């Protein structure tokens, strides 16, 4: 839900930790055109606590 984004050489990585993340709200933020989960499955991202 951001507007300002850096270029490809920059990352602006924000380490999300110490808080219980829910991967069910990301499907209501914006309609995505690509969803490639390597190693993990989109359906079971909720129960998995990385």
């Amino acid at each position: 839900n951001a507007t300002t984004f850096a270029s490809v050489y920059a990352w602006n990585r924000k380490r999300i930790s110490n808080c219980v993340a829910d991967y069910s709200v990301i499907y209501n933020f914006a309609p995505f055109f690509a969803f490639k989960c390597y190693g993990v499955s989109p359906t079971k991202l909720n129960d998995l606590c990385f």
Binding site: G39, V40, S41
Partner: protein, 50 residues
């Protein structure tokens, strides 16, 4: 002399080593992302999990 009961005490060390190796070879990754079946079933999708 504590080396007289050696033959009988080597039928036990071999069995213990065999059991210890058979148990330790469960935590070795044989080509998977981890060695826990629950982790394989939780992270990966059913196709790659198989």
């Amino acid at each position: 002399t504590p080396s007289a009961l050696g033959k009988l005490q080597d039928v036990v060390n071999h069995n213990a080593q065999a059991l210890n190796t058979l148990v330790k070879q469960l935590s070795s990754k044989f080509g998977a992302i981890s060695s826990v079946l629950n982790d394989i079933l939780s992270r990966l999708d059913p196709p790659e999990a198989e």
